[PDB]
RNA sequence: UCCGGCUCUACCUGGCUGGAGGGCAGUGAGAAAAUGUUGUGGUUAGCGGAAAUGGCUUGGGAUGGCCUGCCGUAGACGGUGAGAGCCCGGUACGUGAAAACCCGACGUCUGUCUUGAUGGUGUUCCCGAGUAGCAGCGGGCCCGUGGAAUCUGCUGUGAAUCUGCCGGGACCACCCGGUAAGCCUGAAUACUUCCCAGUGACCGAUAGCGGAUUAGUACCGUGAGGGAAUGGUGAAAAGUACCCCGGGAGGGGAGUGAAAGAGUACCUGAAACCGUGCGCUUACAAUCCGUCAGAGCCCUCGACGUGUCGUGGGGUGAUGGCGUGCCU
RNA sequence: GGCGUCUGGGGGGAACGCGGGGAAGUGAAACAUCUCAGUACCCGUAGGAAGAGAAAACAAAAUGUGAUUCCGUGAGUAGUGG
């Protein structure tokens, strides 16, 4: 899906346009991902509830995978025909990311 | 008699064609051209529209209640038009829209159209759009920029010369054609028309005999 | 073509019964089974796949406008917080199958003609029998019993084999064509329960399949059988934490949110219908309920002057005249 | 006929096919012959397609055609018909 948990991303669209972020979880069945520090919502939880500021899911087509060189870059797929993997790869450099 | 200069992508001219007089000095008959394009569009149009009348719907084949004594009106099926769920009456049906325009009216249309463009100097010729056997749309686009500035344009390239087709296909305005299926709507919708020389020769020695 | 033996038999011939090189053909309708190679041949999962975090402004959000670049064998389509060729999914294009399945391809395997043919010459024999034909009732052929052939069904009767027989619209003679009553035969043709991919001058929740919602369900009927209704919050639930009235429902503040004239009875939110306020009018009057004249009061625009007529306009409208709903 | 063994068939299906049976309301301004229709429906059996199919055929003196089927025309004609 060109994003996995543990990757790092750059936000495009929203009030939080221009934000780095770490991916925490993804929801591939609906193309949405919960990035850290973005989409802050003041959820009410009643117990002893409280107005608490939590994350919410971006849609995955509002984030570019940050290049290993620290710039927003696309990603693509070579093959290491020996090992038979399909490595996710930037389309500026060609490196392993 | 109108003359055309072939044109090259590399920035030169090869030769000149001396177009016929009778194909390309016909006077247009606007009613004729109207009729024929209307026919083309009609035959394009497919008749996928059908509805279920009173005799194809579900049920209704029982007189729902008495004729008399009830108080209410008289009814013979629960699927008649005036009900809610009932049959369409005079509905659409799957039908054909083609109409049989003759060969002479058609060809008269096409010749008159090509004349309308020729007199106004919108028929350009060309040997090719490309260098050898490798499509590149940037080439054809630059060449049409050299040769033309209008929005829309027609291209007539034969079957074997697939590279020009594959090249110019993706452009916004262009609408490519083979001269064996040369028609009238596709001509008139345009502003300029780019023939290949093979195409002209085929067209002319196919019609003229 | 060579021979093995056979023509009852040893011997000359003619004719069989065997094997052999060979040829032909093959899963054919013309006999039939499996065999193993086998084609980037096809189907049954998929995969890569070009190019802008571009600049100013608006806005909650830019995918908009304007200005700058690029790709293009890819500007088809869709989605993404508002119309996205350059975000995403994917397209043009090229790739891909251990196994199974289908096409042929082969080599097996199987037969099969090979011991043979071209022509000569005068006469006997055979050429599909309860049938063809004829008569009686009937069907269907353009043809309704008509002069009515051909094709036929049931009964009854019932012939010949080539100078034979059946037809050429009654029938007869001549000529013509053809050789019944034994059998198989592909391709063109018709069709879609299901499956795959798309198109639409087709519908868009009283439409379209009866069924966008648990739908042949609920409900009805003993039973066969009939047979409905209900789509939309917003960009994401951030679905109102907390306080006050109340038993609770429900609500008011405080909040979220771009907007709560978006609150899980939620896009917009008409009319009928139900009411609350403000102005005029209405309790001595006979009203298809209106129209023409119009007093009086209230609102308004404008020229002026301490309030005031006007090439005015609008709501009500005392009172007078006229006036017998709409359709078929 | 009884006993044992071996192989088949048995039912479902949306249409399409072939053989058989087989109506009526309707039209005729009534109606029975006729028509509606050999339709609907029912039966028996199939196949991926079926059935038909190699002349006991056409034709008209033309020195002609050469299995069958399905499409276009001939033709709404020659004709048939209370």
Curated annotation (Swiss-Prot), chain A:
Pfam families cross-referenced by the UniProt entry: KOW, ribosomal_L24
Keywords: Ribonucleoprotein, Ribosomal protein, RNA-binding, rRNA-binding
Xref: SMART domains: KOW
Cleaved signal peptide residues: none
Top-rank taxon: Bacteria
Molecular function per GO: rRNA binding; structural constituent of ribosome
UniProt-listed GO biological process terms: translation
CDD domains linked: KOW_RPL26
GO cellular component: ribonucleoprotein complex; ribosome
Subunit-structure text: Part of the 50S ribosomal subunit.
Primary role: One of two assembly initiator proteins, it binds directly to the 5'-end of the 23S rRNA, where it nucleates assembly of the 50S subunit.
Similarity comment: family membership: Belongs to the universal ribosomal protein uL24 family.
Identification of the protein by name: Large ribosomal subunit protein uL24
Species assigned in the record: Mycolicibacterium smegmatis (strain ATCC 700084 / mc(2)155) (Mycobacterium smegmatis)
Underlying gene: rplX
From Swiss-Prot, chain B:
Cellular component annotations (GO), alphabetically ordered: ribonucleoprotein complex; ribosome
Keyword Ribonucleoprotein (UniProt): yes
Signal peptide feature range: none
SUPFAM superfamilies noted in UniProt: Ribosomal protein L4
GO BP, one annotated term: translation
Record region (Disordered): 42-99
Record keywords: Ribonucleoprotein, Ribosomal protein, RNA-binding, rRNA-binding
Domain of life: Bacteria
TM region(s), chain numbering: none
GO molecular function, a single term: structural constituent of ribosome
Quaternary organization: Part of the 50S ribosomal subunit.
Family: Belongs to the universal ribosomal protein uL4 family.
Role, per record: One of the primary rRNA binding proteins, this protein initially binds near the 5'-end of the 23S rRNA. It is important during the early stages of 50S assembly. It makes multiple contacts with different domains of the 23S rRNA in the assembled 50S subunit and ribosome. Forms part of the polypeptide exit tunnel.
Name under which the protein is recorded: Large ribosomal subunit protein uL4
Organism, scientific name: Mycolicibacterium smegmatis (strain ATCC 700084 / mc(2)155) (Mycobacterium smegmatis)
Lineage of the species this protein comes from: Bacteria, Bacillati, Actinomycetota, Actinomycetes, Mycobacteriales
